[PDB]
Amino acid sequence: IVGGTASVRGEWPWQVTLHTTSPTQRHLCGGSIIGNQWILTAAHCFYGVESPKILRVYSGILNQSEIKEDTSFFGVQEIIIHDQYKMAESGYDIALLKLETTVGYGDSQRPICLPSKGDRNVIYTDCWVTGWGYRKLRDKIQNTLQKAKIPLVTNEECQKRYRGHKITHKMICAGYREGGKDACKGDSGGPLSCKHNEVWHLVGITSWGEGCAQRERPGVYTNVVEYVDWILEKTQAV
Ligand SMILES: COC(=O)Nc1ccc2c(c1)CCCCCCC[C@H](NC(=O)/C=C/c1cc(Cl)ccc1-n1cnnn1)c1nc-2c(Cl)[nH]1
Known part of the structure; x- marks a missing residue:
């Protein structure tokens, strides 16, 4: 992370x-x-x-x-x-x-609860990515599990950031426009966990990105609800 x-x-x-x-x-x-x-x-x-x-x-x-x-x-x-x-x-x-x-x-x-198919229209505002991955591209696995709060990005905005890829509705993106917080090497497969009405839901699975935490390069996650x-x-x- x-x-x-x-x-x-x-x-x-x-x-x-x-x-x-x-x-x-x-x-x-x-x-x-x-x-x-x-x-x-x-x-x-x-x-x-x-x-x-x-x-x-x-x-x-x-x-x-x-x-x-x-x-x-x-x-x-x-x-x-x-x-x-x-x-x-x-x-x-x-x-x-x-x-x-x-x-x-x-x-x-x-x-962790899976998202409800009836919650395809909810707006999650309290999302966290966790893992023992690197803190930057050239690093090592961390001893202590790390966490970072990251905002969800719309599919349209994520597609603008990955012009050479097809960002589908089976993907969900997350990250700050300015960069700085993201998953990295060793975090993949872990959760993107979002709290909604006091219950944690598994919204994403850490998948890929271009580099780590770069400006205008949100992390791409499997969209679990789909x-x-x-x-x-x-x-x-x-
Ligand atoms: C001591 O133990 C270790 O060092 N173990 C150990 C150490 C490292 C690794 C392994 C084991 C697994 C590699 C093979 C399977 C997994 C292969 C791919 C995997 N990707 C990610 O975890 C995340 C990607 C990622 C995800 C988001 Cl959402 C955003 C940006 C991302 N990045 C883009 N570039 N970097 N990150 C990965 N994981 C590692 C590497 Cl190396 N790459």
């Missing part, structure tokens, strides 16, 4: 850190708990990942230093990537992880 501040423990209890163990163990991406065996994340995180066996999901984490060989994690039974996904910049950047065991909810780990039915198809299958 660029221009962020440290989170306090339990502030974002749906945030997870997804690690890969191959060739060595390290943080790969963020994700969000959406159900008791389900993480919602970005499809691009799995480029070159040939099996769910190399993944570990850690929940209830503030600091990456909490993770050692003896730290509990959730294994991944299945990686579900949207069938129309080709690359982040074209959209459909969404994936589900089905966990091998169930998450026991509590004050350190619990799900995928609620896809999520229910995969997670509530008969």
Whole structure:
């Protein structure tokens, strides 16, 4: 996260850190708990990942230093990537992880609500992007989970900022015209969380941008409300 501040423990209890163990163990991406065996994340995180066996999901984490060989994690039974996904910049950047065991909810780990299809017309004014990513393009993963408050940008304005891309209504953009606060490398797959009527909703999934926090280059997120039915198809299958 660029221009962020440290989170306090339990502030974002749906945030997870997804690690890969191959060739060595390290943080790969963020994700969000959406159900008791389900993480919602970005499809691009799995480029070159040939099996769910190399993944570990850690929940209830503030600091990456909490993770050692003896730290509990959730294994991944299945990686579900949207069938129309080709690359982040074209959209459909969404994936589900089905966990091998169930998450026991509590004050350190619990799900975030999905947006309501009836809330496609709400104006969210209290949105935050979180993660352990870099603070600038050439940096390193941060120990403490960071947070930054960022305003949503209309599709028309976002399209003006990315003249050479097709910014669809399945994407949602966020950032200041002047730049300075954004997601960065290592934040992808995590949430863009917005508080509406005292309830947090998962509005976006951190996806891509041109550089980090640049003037007139908002971050581009998967627009989760446009995928609620896809999520229910995969997670509530008969
Ligand atoms: C010690 O552990 C580490 O160092 N781990 C570790 C360290 C870093 C990384 C990995 C692991 C995962 C790489 C492969 C999958 C993921 C590949 C893409 C991913 N992108 C993002 O996270 C965000 C992008 C992004 C998103 C928004 Cl909304 C706005 C601007 C953005 N940026 C544009 N340019 N930079 N940011 C990424 N993540 C990393 C890089 Cl390197 N790039």
